[model samples]
Target: HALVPYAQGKSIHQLFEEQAEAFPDRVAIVFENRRLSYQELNRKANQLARALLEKGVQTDSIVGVMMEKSIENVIAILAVLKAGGAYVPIDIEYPRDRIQYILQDSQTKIVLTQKSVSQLVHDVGYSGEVVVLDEEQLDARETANLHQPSKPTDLAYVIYTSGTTGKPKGTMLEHKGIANLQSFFQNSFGVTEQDRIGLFASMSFAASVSEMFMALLSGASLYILSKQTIHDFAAFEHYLSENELTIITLPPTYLTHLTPERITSLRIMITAGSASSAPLVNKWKDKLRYINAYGLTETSCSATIWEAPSNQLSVQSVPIGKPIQNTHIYIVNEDLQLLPTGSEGELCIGGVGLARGYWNRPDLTAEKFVDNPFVPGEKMYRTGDLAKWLTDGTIEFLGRI
Candidate 1:
C-alpha cells in the first residue's frame, strides 16, 4: 500500500499552516498555568525567526540552543527552522565539556537560550552570540512581519548522538525527513485535535521531536511533563489521568515502570529508545495499545513500528512489524548485499524518513551514509541495528551490537 506523504522538506513550522487554518484559536500547548493556541505558537515562532535573521543567521546556518523544554523552547526551535537554519539542541543538563564539544563541532555562531544557560557557554569558554529568550528578548523585536520562506529539502535541525567511539556526532535532518515521519506517525496512531499529548522525553532525544511536532501539526494539545513527574511513575500517571492524556511517547525504561493500573485511561502508548522484551509486553496486556518503534538519531524518529494487537497480549518475542509505507527496510551483509528472509544482518533504511547525513563530519558521514544498492545512485542510511524477518513478513528486531 502506498502511504501518503504529509509535509516533507518544509520546516516543521509548516505545520502551523494547518493549525492556523483550522483551529486558529484552539489551544496547542499547555504548561503548568499557561496555554497557547496554534495562532499564538505560529505568531511567536514568526517573531523569533525575524529576531534570528536580525542577528545575522541565514540559510543552512547552525544555531545552537541550550535550554529546557518550555513554551519558549518550542518557539526558539521553530524560529530557527523558519529562518532557514538548522537547530543544534544542546541539552543544558549534559556535562560542560561534552556541551563544548558539540558547540565546537557544529561550529554554531549563534546560540538562543535563557540567561541562566548563557553562563554555561561562558563557563565553557565559547564566544558565540547569545540571544536570551525571556520577556526582554520577546519584547526586543517581532519577526512576524517577515515572510516564512523554507522548502522541504531545507535543513530542519541537527541532533547529536553519543558516538560508538565516545565522541558526539550531529545527525542532520532535512525538512522532508521530519514531514515524512510526521505523516506516517499521524496515520499509524490516529492523533487528532481532541487528543492531549504528553511529552515526557528530553528535547535532546529524537523521541521528543515526534511527541512535540505531532501535537503541533495535528492541533492536539501538548502537555510538557515536569522533571519530577518523569522520575516518578505514580506522579506521571497522575498527570496523565488529570490531564486526560490519550497518547504518550517515551523510552522503554520508563514504560517498564508503568503498571497496568496506571495506563487504564491511555488510548495509545509508544515505546522506543531501546528494544522491549516479551516480559514487559505481557505485563502491560489489556491496558493500552502498544507500539514498539525502532529508530535512532540518524533517522528522524521511527523508520518502522510494530503495533501490538489488542487480542495478543504476550508474544514471547516483540515483533517490530514492518516498515511504514513508502519506506524500505533491508537486512544486508557486510558487502551491502541484501540477505535472504531468515538471514541475520545489519539493518538499512531508505525512503523519505532517512536523514541527509551527519552535520559536518563528511568522512564519518560517508562511512555510515552509503549508496543504496537497492536503488541505483540513491543513498540509504546504514542503521547499525541488527534484525531478521519473521514468517509473517514482519521484521523481528534483535538487539544492536
Candidate 2:
C-alpha cells in the first residue's frame, strides 16, 4: 500500500490556515479559563507574524521559544511558523548553560519568552532580540497579511536532545514529515473536530508536536495543562473528565496511576517512551482503546503502535506493532543484512517521519543516518533499538542497544 495519501508541498502553517479559514468560529485551544476560537488564534498569530517580520525573521531561520506551557507559548510557536521560521524550544527548567548552548548552536536570532523567564535568557548571555509576548505591545495588523512563503521541505522546528558529550544535539524536522504524521492520525483514527486532545507533554518534547499540530490541523480543540496540574493525579483526572478530552498520549508511568473509572471520559489512550506492563494494558483494554506506541525523537512521535486486544490475558510485553503510514521498519544485523524473523537485531526506520539530521553535526549525522539498501535514493535512521519480529509480523521491542 502506498503511504503518500497526504497532500504534499504544503507547509504546516498553510494547513493550519486552511482549518482556520474553514472553521473560524470553532474553538481551537483551551487553557485554564481561556478559550480561543480559530479566528482569534489566527488573528493573534498574524499580529505576531507581522511583528516577527519587522524584526527581520525570514524563512528557514531558527527562533528560540522559552516559556512555560500556556496559551501564549502556543501563539509564539504559530507566530514563528507564520513568519517563516523554525522554532527551537528551550526548556525553562534546563540549566542556563544548556539553554545557551542550544541557542548558540542553532544560531537563533530572536527569542520569544515571558517576562518571568526573560531573566533566564539574559543569564545565558544571549544577545539576540527578545520579544516578551506579555509585555510586547504588538500593533494590530491586517489578518490577511501573509509573510514569507514556506515549502514542505523547509525546516519546521529544531529539537535539542541530550548529548553523550554533555552538549545537546539539535534534531531538525521538516514540514512534510509532520504533515504525513497528521494525515496518518486522521486516516487511521478518524480524528474529527469534536475530539478534544490533552496537551500534557512539554513543548520541548516531540510528543508535543503530535498534540499541537494534530489538533490544530484537524480542527480539534487542544487542552493545555500546567505543570502543577499534571503532577497532581487527582487534578489531572478531574481536568480530563471536565474538559471531555477524547484523546491523550503520555508516558507509561503515568498510566499506572489511572483506572478505567477515573478516565471514563477518554475515548483513546496511548502510552509510549517506555515499556508498558501487560497488567496495565489488560486493565485498560476493556475500558477504552489502548495503544502501545514505540519510536524515538529522531523518528517523530511514533513509528509503530500496538492496539491491545479486548480480552487478552497477561503477557511478557506488548509488541511495538508495524510501521506507520509511509514508514518502513527493518531489523538488520551488524553487517546491515536483513535478519530473519525471530532474530534479534537493530531496528532501522525509513520514510516520511525521519528527521532532517542533527543540526551542525554532519559527521555524527553521516554515522547514524545511512543510505537505505532497500530503497534507492532514500536514507534510513539507525534507531539503535533492538527488536525481533514475532510470528504475527509485529515487532517485539527487545530494548535499546
Candidate 3:
C-alpha cells in the first residue's frame, strides 16, 4: 500500500504557481548571500520562457543548458519547461571537448548560459543563440503576466545518463515525473515553506532534479553549496551551522566526512545515490530524522524512502519503505511473472514517478519499460535492482544483485 494519495494529470509548474500566489515573499532561491522570492523567480522564469518562444523554440524542441548549479541555471530550466520545451542541463564541469560533443549530438539550438561560458559553444564552431543571464534577460516584460499552463505529460527536462561504453544518453522526464517527486518529498518528509534546504548535488545528477524543483515549488529556501565546500566536510559543516539549515539530502559517502559537532545542527537528514549503511545509521541514530531513499535517473529522483527511527535495530539494513503514496512497487521474475511475498527478484516501479522514456531512444525505452504482469493495464519500469519482501510486507532492499 502507498502512504500518500497520488494526484494525476498535473504539471510540476502548477505547484510552483501555487507557491508564487500564496507565498510570493517567501525565499525560493538562495545563492550564497542573495535571495530570490517565489514571485521574483516565477516572473524571471516567465520572461525567459517568453524569450525562448520569441526565438522559435516550440513545444518539442530540446533546449540545451550549459552552466553550473546557479540561479541562472534554475531560471533557465524553469523557462525551458514553461516554453513547452524540454531542457538538457549540460554540466560545465565536463571536459570542454566532451561538452561540445553533447551539444552537437543533442541537436541543441538555443542555449541558456552565463557570459563567461559563451566561449564554450563558440569554440566548437557552433552558431546557436546563447541567452546570457543578465539584468536585461531577467527583466519583467509587460507580457510576462501571460503564463502558459503545461500538461502533465509534457517533457520537463532531458537529463544525460552516462554511457558505459559510448556517449551519454538523454533521459526525458515529463512534468508529472517531477510533480510526483516534489509531492512525494513534501508529504513524506513534511517539507514546508519554513524549511531551509541544503543543495549539495550537481545539476546533471538526478538528485538535483528533485532538490531544486521541490525547493522552488514548495516555497522553501535553497542554499547553494560551493564545490570546494561539497568536497571538504569541515567547510560543509561550517556552512550548515552558519545557514541554520532545516533539511539536508546527500549521499552517505559525503556524510562519513562529517564530525559529531556538525551532525547536531541538522533537523532532517536524507540519504540516497546509494544504499544506506548500518554503521552510518548508528552513528547519527538519535541526532536527526534520517531517511533512506531509492531512485534512479529513469524514475526522476526517489521512488521510495525508508524513514529512520531512533529505536531501529543495529546491524540491520534500513527498509526502503513502502511505495511513496501515489507510487507502486512489485517484485517480479525475469519472465515478467509476479513474485510472491518474501520471494527475491527484480524490483519494479509503476506510477506517476516514472519518466516518459529515454530522449530519442525509443528502442532503449521499450527495453526497460514493459507491461506490468501484476497490474492488468499499467506499465512498470524494470528498476534493475534486486530486493526481497520483508515479513512486514514492506520491501527490504538487498544490495543490487
**Candidate achieving the largest TM-score:** 2
lDDT of 3 at 173: 81
Show where candidate 1 strays beyond 4 Å: 1-3, 135-145
- Tens digit per residue, CA lDDT, model 1, 59-141: 78999998888888888887887777888889899898999899999999998888777778789887978887883456556
Model 2, residue pairs in steric clash: none
For model 3, the stretches where C-alpha displacement exceeds 4 angstroms are: 1-7, 135-140, 312-315
Per-residue C-alpha lDDT of model 2 across residues 228-284, encoded as one tens digit per residue: 789999889988988889999889899888756876588889898998887788778
Residue 155, candidate 3: Cα error in Å is: 0.4
When 2 and 3 are scored with lDDT, the better candidate is 2
What is the TM-score of each predicted model, taking all chains together?
0.95, 0.97, 0.93
Q: Over all chains combined, what TM-score does candidate 1 have?
A: 0.95
lDDT of each structure? 0.80, 0.86, 0.78
Candidate 2 Cα outliers beyond 4 Å, as residue runs: 145-147, 163-165, 310-316
Candidate 1, run of 10 with poorest lDDT: 136-145
lDDT of 3 by residue, 118-210 (tens): 777577665787777663444645435445656888887888867567677887788877776666767777878888888888887878878
Clashes of 2: 0
